[PDB]
Amino acid sequence: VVKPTDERIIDPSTANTQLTGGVCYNTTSGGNKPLAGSPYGYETWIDTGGGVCSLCWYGADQGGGAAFKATWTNPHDFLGRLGYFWNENKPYSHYENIYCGFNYTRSGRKTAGDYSYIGIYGWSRNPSASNSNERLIEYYIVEDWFGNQWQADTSPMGINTTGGTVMGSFTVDGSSYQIIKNTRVNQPSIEGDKTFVQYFSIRQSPRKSGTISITEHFKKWEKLGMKLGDNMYECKFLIEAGAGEGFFDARLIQFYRADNEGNILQITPHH
Incomplete structure (x- = not known):
């Protein structure tokens, strides 16, 4: 796979100008809500x-x-x-x-409760899976978190936070990632209260800027028998905070898609 060199891609490392003029949502959105003049949607819980x-x-x-x-x-x-x-x-x-x-600032250690997540998140559906537990999937690619009273935010979370089982690991985008599978037994989901599985890639060296090669995670999960199925729900940049008082403030979140030759299929956004 050829990494894209398209000049519309913004270098994340130096994309650190504070943005202004947000449009804010203060309540639960009730699912995905499309954004005007954008291919993206937001969700709040x-x-x-x-x-x-x-x-x-x-x-x-x-x-x-x-x-x-x-x-x-x-x-x-x-x-x-x-x-x-x-x-x-x-x-x-x-x-x-x-x-x-991506490139963001955030509040410091212990400002988001006992567990927290920053990175990529979504769901996928796999109805033909023989194991009924595996027909719904919640997924995380965890670039960073806020640590807690017990663990520094510079230390990667593991199964003590996520639950489940370490399946393996690989290296991409400048860090090892530990791959974890967890089963959520009779828990809230996009399909109501049920049993489903969670897939995690945990960045071993947490960071606040860079590029996530999302598809590389999907490929490695599937090789480990962690199948996503044939109905991907979403692929979004997430902040999750268990508790605490804090903030997350992105100077950059740029999604793009490219084929194996590295040509742009989708990107946002005279001298």
Whole structure:
């Protein structure tokens, strides 16, 4: 696979200008909500029993088009996410090579509760799987987190946070990633309360900027027998905060897709 060199790709390492003029959402969105003049959709999950949370999109024309800020004040499992919404009966391979360039600031260690996640997130459906537990999949590519009282945010989370079993590992985008499979038994899902599986890639060296070669994770999961099936739901940049008081503020979130030759299939956004 040839890495894309298209000049519309924004270098994540130096994409660190603070953005302004967000459009903010302060309540649960009830699923994916499309964004005007954008290929992306956002979703918020904001427990009304917790404190104030928000997700603010920075619009279609700056920060790579999927940039957002989120804030939380003592949430109960806040999730804010923005990116591709699919749900069109297509396996991951249909979308070819998916990349996300990112750069953000965030609050420090212990500002997001006992567990937290930053990176790529979605679901996929695999109804023909023989194991009924494996017919619905929730997935995470975890670039970073906020640590907690017990563990530094510079230390990667593991199965003590995620649950489940270490299946293997591989190296991509400058770090080893540990691959974890967890079964969620009779838990809330996009299909109601049920048993489903979670796939994780945990970045061993956490970071706040770079490029995620998303499709490389999907390929390695599938090689380990962690199948995604044939109806990818979404592929979004996520901040999840279990609790705490904090923020996440992206200067860049740029999704793009390219074929194996490295030619752009999809990207956002005279002298």
